[PDB]
């Protein structure tokens, strides 16, 4: 029962409306089937496939769920809406047709649902949908400005010398908002939900100077919902609208003074998140150690 | 390491802890320090260059830091880091106030104290909390018109959860209309003192009163003939900055109008029943 948490994604509006206008565009694939709900909070996603022609059932753990019956029964939607604390533990009324679920986390991959998605797809679900049924994207970001701020701060602090914390700052990524992107950008991973979890501790990429100081790499991640035949899609990148995603910012232990094609190579690798990054810029090697807690 | 960069540029706090340190400097020299939660072990060395040896305790991995730290500003002769001491000690230094004084506090320091603390210095050794009204109608009313209609949907019922909910954020000096009044703490003689106060408060000019704003003060121990600091609206910035409770409705009071109240806080923390004369709130942080 943390309201800003959910006032935060109800107010997200590409999230909100992204999810809403994805179930119309399929509302003729919603009537008369049963839908699961997979994190439902307040219950909004599950309202949404109700009155669009769905039975929804929605399942979350936390205390959040009676608010959502109360506010399934405000609705007048008692009778379509079934909601269940507790996925792996709760035991649903049926043995689904379609899954709505909120999953999606700060580097996508961080606090996500995605584990209980394809338990819920492997366990529940009929040709099914999922929505959404992802990718992950990076560039170059410039920040030199802010970033020799907040490393400059531990050389001295009250006359004592804090030195050795500057690699915690470079080490910890930054969830902001950040044309401060200098280099192109390269898709890390794709994801299919329907056919994808050891799949998810996993790249190569390529990025090229579009014209500055370059001090790290921002990312994001876009999504796809699925559509009849002949796509409601979204992103997070720092070119999109807000979203209370952000992007996620990772910074380089040097800061590197590019021209227009110099080329930053690399190798990503993430897993449970712990996150190594091995470098070559051209115009010459590092790495970089992230870790998300 | 976002708190501990939050910790570190709360200047009004740690040069409290350092001019107390400096204060008591004359009984610091040659004595055994424990410092409660001593993060990054700042205020270890600040002990440590005054003339004390020092213990820190942290259960965090910051420990590790700590050592580092204090390796490089060659204070490992006089400063040994982390059910837990090297001693069977004259002073404990503790940063363990949370937001409300008591939410998530260490208050940890009483154990120190019983157990391995006679006429020893508790650095800082007294608490109070404080509360006064205030003006925040065009906010508080924003976020509780937002859920008349969402997305076309009545989220009536979710209304009570926003004015339950307690707000931690720094209130403007121009914004407190009445005046301030809960508890005092002696940490020499003060558990079950913390589950515990009646107030009483006075409009000082026409406007509308929306909810009360609370702090908390600070005393350290000073030698005979102290250092404080507060947390509240009309002292300079601090990272605990203010925790504001909403009322259900909305007072649209005249200078001299009263507000008499008697709040009530028990163990997570439950928290307050008014009356204003011109003649209720619940509120739980988890």
């Known amino acids: 029962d943390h309201y800003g948490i959910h006032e935060e994604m109800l107010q997200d509006t590409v999230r909100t409306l992204s999810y809403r206008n994805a179930i119309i565009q399929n509302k003729d694939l919603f009537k008369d089937k049963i839908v699961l709900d997979v994190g439902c909070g307040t219950g909004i996603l599950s309202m949404f496939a109700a009155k669009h022609g769905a039975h929804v059932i929605g399942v979350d753990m936390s205390s959040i769920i009676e608010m959502a019956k109360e506010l399934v029964e405000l609705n007048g939607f008692s009778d379509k809406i079934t909601l269940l604390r507790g996925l792996e533990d709760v035991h649903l009324p049926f043995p689904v047709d379609i899954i709505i679920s909120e999953w999606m986390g700060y580097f996508l991959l961080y606090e996500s649902m995605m584990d209980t998605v394809l338990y819920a797809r492997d366990h529940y679900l009929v040709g099914g949908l ?88 921002v990312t994001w991640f876009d999504i796809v919902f699925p559509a009849p035949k002949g796509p409601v899609e979204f992103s997070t990148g720092p070119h999109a609208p807000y979203t209370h995603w952000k992007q996620t910012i990772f910074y380089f232990p040097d800061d590197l003074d590019a021209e227009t094609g110099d080329t930053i190579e690399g190798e990503l690798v993430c897993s449970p998140l712990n996150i190594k990054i091995s470098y070559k810029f051209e115009s010459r090697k590092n790495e970089g150690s992230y870790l998300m807690h």
């Not at 401060?180 to 794709?190: A, F, G, H, Q, R």
Request: charged share 25%; with cysteine.
């Open 130 to 217: 999922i929505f959404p049924d992802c990718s992950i994207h990076l560039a170059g970001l410039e920040d030199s400005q802010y970033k020799d701020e907040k490393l400059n701060y531990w050389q001295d602090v009250y006359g004592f010398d804090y030195s050795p914390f500057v690699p915690l700052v470079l080490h910890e990524p930054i969830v902001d908002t950040v044309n401060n992107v200098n280099t192109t950008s390269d898709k890390l991973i794709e994801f299919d939900l329907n056919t994808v979890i050891s799949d998810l501790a996993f790249s190569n990429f390529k990025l090229t100077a579009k014209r500055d100081m370059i001090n790290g790499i």
